[PDB]
Design a protein around this ligand. Sequence first.
Ligand SMILES: Cc1nc2n(c(=O)c1CCN1CCC(c3noc4cc(F)ccc34)CC1)CCCC2
Ligand SMILES: CCCCCCCC/C=C\CCCCCCCC(=O)O
Length: 423
Amino acid sequence: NYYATLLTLLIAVIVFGNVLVCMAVSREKALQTTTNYLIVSLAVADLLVATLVMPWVVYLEVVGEWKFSRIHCDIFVTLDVMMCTASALNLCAISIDRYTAVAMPTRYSSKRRVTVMISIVWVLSFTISCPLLFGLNNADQNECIIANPAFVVYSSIVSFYVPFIVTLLVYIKIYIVLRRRRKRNIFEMLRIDEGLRLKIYKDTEGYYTIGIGHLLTKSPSLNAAKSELDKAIGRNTNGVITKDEAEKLFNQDVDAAVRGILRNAKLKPVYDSLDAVRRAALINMVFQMGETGVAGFTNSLRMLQQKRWDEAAVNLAKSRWYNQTPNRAKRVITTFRTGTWDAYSQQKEKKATQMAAIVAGVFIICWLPFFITHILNIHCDCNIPPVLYSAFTWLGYVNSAVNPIIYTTFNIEFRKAFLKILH
Ligand SMILES: Cc1nc2n(c(=O)c1CCN1CCC(c3noc4cc(F)ccc34)CC1)CCCC2
Ligand SMILES: CCCCCCCC/C=C\CCCCCCCC(=O)O
């Protein structure tokens, strides 16, 4: 047949791509991390799908019927559920290892942590699929387990929806931490450049300000400038505030600065194109020069928009801004060029955390239409086009071959590693 050939071709792609993932991590220094060890554990889960499950699936297409015995069927379904649950439980362990790398501060303590995580993945996958060999410990005596009306509920909830929610809660907790970091990094970036003042003072235009460039009022009365300060800090500040109280005010000024940047037709385009780190450098400039002045760097802003980080740095050093405050300018131009916090303190893990979430998302993209279909079989009893049911099942098995394709795109170390193995 034609569809059986494609399935066998898929088996080759699954094996070819995932054998690469194993050898690459096994032989490349910069690829020998905790996450990458859980990645090869993920590659083994997919390697076993190609070898212990797909032969049953390609057989299932040539024959056109489930012409196994009842024990062969139970074995196949048990292995199919297990090797796919290991993929889900591996993506869960990957997120958790991604949480500890971001949220927590050893070459020996970490390796022991990976060994425990991997063992839990495969022992749990076994214990979850082991009931399927024995009638799901339910009432289905003389029939295969996939004929059990409770199999769909079991493998959906236990093997998929519960790993789905837990992993989703971890990544949400991960995003929240990274967003607190960006709000903290920008505060430090400007208390180094602009300066943190805890008592009321006058800016260069005569207005009473406090914190990091926060005009209390444009009124000349000092007593009135204190009224607006206490109405915003909540307490009788008496002129002095905490560095924490000033950090709350700074975040308000930053958010306000973004509402205007996006409402500025000359700054909104480049602002979208910018990485989050380079986006803080643009906020630094509007904090110093205002949105009016930054919009005058048209030749430079287009180069940031065109990813020309080299030239955008060379042009910005030819401005009257670089000549007026050169120390701060060189620090911000460095941030526009490198895209990190080297000038001020940059986490090198974010790139790996973004790839881990992309793999988890592609996973959900591939299997969710399959489990959405199950919900429809139960809801309306409408018999679904078997070509569609067969498609969403194959799409889920296809997921076993997409992960190595993602490592070549989003990871320079994985991409250059594979090309060295093929040469
Ligand atoms: C062979 C077959 N053939 C057909 N259909 C089938 O459902 C099947 C079986 C499909 N297996 C897909 C993976 C499932 C699974 N279990 O646990 C998991 C955990 C995960 F994270 C992700 C997936 C799973 C268990 C069922 C439907 C009718 C068309 C022909
Ligand atoms: C021993 C070194 C580890 C240091 C970081 C801690 C690692 C994770 C610690 C505890 C994991 C919590 C147990 C997870 C329970 C989830 C069960 C569930 O929600 O269904």
